[PDB]
Design an enzyme around this catalytic site. Structure first.
Site, PDB file in Angstrom:
ATOM      1  N   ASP A  22       0.863  -1.171   0.000  1.00 59.54           N
ATOM      2  CA  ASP A  22       0.000   0.000   0.000  1.00 59.54           C
ATOM      3  C   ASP A  22       0.899   1.221   0.000  1.00 59.54           C
ATOM      4  OD1 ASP A  22      -0.957   0.199   3.569  1.00 59.54           O
ATOM      5  OD2 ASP A  22       1.022   0.221   2.615  1.00 59.54           O
ATOM      6  N   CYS A  79       3.013  -3.359   4.136  1.00 56.17           N
ATOM      7  CA  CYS A  79       2.172  -2.232   4.527  1.00 56.17           C
ATOM      8  C   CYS A  79       2.943  -1.660   5.724  1.00 56.17           C
ATOM      9  CB  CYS A  79       0.690  -2.634   4.801  1.00 56.17           C
ATOM     10  SG  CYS A  79       0.139  -3.585   6.237  1.00 56.17           S
ATOM     11  N   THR A  81       2.690  -1.936   8.849  1.00 58.14           N
ATOM     12  CA  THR A  81       2.850  -2.941   9.885  1.00 58.14           C
ATOM     13  C   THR A  81       2.977  -4.337   9.273  1.00 58.14           C
ATOM     14  OG1 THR A  81       2.035  -2.890  12.182  1.00 58.14           O
ATOM     15  CG2 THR A  81       0.686  -4.014  10.556  1.00 58.14           C
ATOM     16  N   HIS A 112       8.110 -25.397   8.873  1.00 57.44           N
ATOM     17  CA  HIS A 112       7.034 -26.117   9.524  1.00 57.44           C
ATOM     18  C   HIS A 112       5.646 -25.804   9.013  1.00 57.44           C
ATOM     19  CE1 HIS A 112       9.657 -26.727  13.400  1.00 57.44           C
ATOM     20  NE2 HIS A 112      10.321 -26.968  12.283  1.00 57.44           N
ATOM     21  N   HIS A 147       4.573 -32.200  10.338  1.00 60.31           N
ATOM     22  CA  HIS A 147       3.914 -30.923  10.078  1.00 60.31           C
ATOM     23  C   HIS A 147       2.814 -30.976   9.031  1.00 60.31           C
ATOM     24  CE1 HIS A 147       8.193 -29.963  11.275  1.00 60.31           C
ATOM     25  NE2 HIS A 147       7.470 -29.551  12.300  1.00 60.31           N
TER      26      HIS A 147
END
EC number: 5.3.1.6
Lengths: 159, 159
Positions: A22, A79, A81, A112, A147
């Protein structure tokens, strides 16, 4: 050249990546894309191209749908964060996005969790750390085994 | 004391559902202890030992309670926090943040109105994990323009 690093980036396991960010994440775009290219990956640039305000859900969707439709090996989102855009991507079936601010979580997410989308915040991590994070994610490989049951389970919830 | 530079805001969430991996268990008691010290009622959904177990189960316990409105939010701890957060985000109505620093957790709250927080016991130390949870509990959703982005997330999940 130098061979001074203590942690060496293993060759990328993903040949082409769909990239999205963004207006805030755009701050790291060029240099990150440049880094991807210099590591030999083809970047499918799904915008954006400016710091003018825009909505992350769209970019998360573009990259998410590309990764799910198998037209690209993985996706990288940015972005401020990384968290929001990360959540949006995880809402798509077949997607497993990891958001973090250090190499370990990224490397382990592949090993994993066989993650196919990576995200981080341009307002949380610097460029160099971000690049080390991408190296760790790109070079890692899924380990399967015990996994597969957990990842298989995540696909079950997508119900 | 009043010596800290960042003050933990009174907790906005009064009741949350806790869940963890056998690896995340490493932080269970002290984190639940801190939670209670903040005045929140913890609804323990296992596990209860360091014996191996699958994280998808506990991500499902917490998620369902979060979405079922029988708790104000959820907190999850696995070795990395990535696996369980991906699992959690797969549930409709859930917006889970995974991080290793307070900024991301706080902002995920303010803008993305997250209702599930996850972190790694192998990534973050106890004191940093406590700071991150304070940042998360005390933060509030700002709505306004960010509401469009949050609405965009639910839209993609249901379709």
């Amino acid at each position: 050249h130098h061979h001074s690093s203590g942690l060496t980036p293993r060759g990328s396991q993903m040949k082409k990546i769909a990239f999205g960010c963004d207006h805030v994440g755009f701050i790291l775009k060029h240099e990150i894309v440049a880094h991807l290219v210099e590591r030999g990956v083809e970047v499918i640039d799904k915008g954006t191209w400016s710091s003018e305000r825009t909505d992350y859900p769209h970019y998360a969707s573009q990259v998410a749908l590309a990764v799910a439709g198998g037209e690209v090996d993985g996706g990288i989102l940015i972005c401020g964060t990384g968290v929001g855009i990360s959540i949006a991507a995880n809402k798509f079936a077949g997607i497993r996005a990891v958001v973090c601010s250090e190499p370990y979580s990224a490397q382990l997410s592949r090993q994993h969790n066989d993650t196919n989308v990576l995200a981080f915040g341009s307002r949380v991590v610097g460029l160099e750390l971000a690049k080390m994070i991408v190296d760790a994610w790109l070079g890692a490989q899924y380990e399967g085994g015990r996994h597969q049951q957990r990842v298989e389970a995540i696909t079950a919830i997508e119900q």
